Design a protein around this ligand. Sequence first.
Ligand code: HEM
Length: 152
Amino acid sequence: AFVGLSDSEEKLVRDAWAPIHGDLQGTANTVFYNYLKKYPSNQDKFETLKGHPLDEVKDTANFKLIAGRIFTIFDNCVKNVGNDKGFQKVIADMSGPHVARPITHGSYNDLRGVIYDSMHLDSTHGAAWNKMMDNFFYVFYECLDGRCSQFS
Ligand code: HEM
């Protein structure tokens, strides 16, 4: 379910993300590369990347576009942590292209893990972050399941 965050937890999320917020594209490029490298089955889900070696595409405009657009969404979710309706709208709006693409929860969860691992959070910040990400995935999966109108 959606579970609201406390005042301190909202603040913890902002602080957790702040290094990434200040280098959004650079962080995105590294994390997206690490994700495709660790979980190579996902590269085929991106038609623009499909059929090339990962090291051949990593320096391309198309790869960086994909990495950046993921991180832009998370940046906007972080922007909206004090606004449940606004946070939910951010997600609802990016959910469409993922609806009925054959991408498993496994795939999305593996991305979440790579993001988490890249942040090297202490357990306090980690817990607040996980509450936000749990909210993210609750909304996202409801929308994938055709229950997005409550959030759109
Ligand atoms: C879970 C975090 C994610 C975020 C924040 C995100 C965000 C986005 C955004 C902003 C779009 C473009 C929406 C539009 O055109 O209006 C998009 C498209 C797309 N996404 Fe994601 N996404 C995520 C996860 C993934 C994963 C894990 C995959 C595959 C494994 C994936 C595959 C795609 C594909 C194939 C497209 C259509 C774009 C294309 O053909 O490249 N996404 N995503």
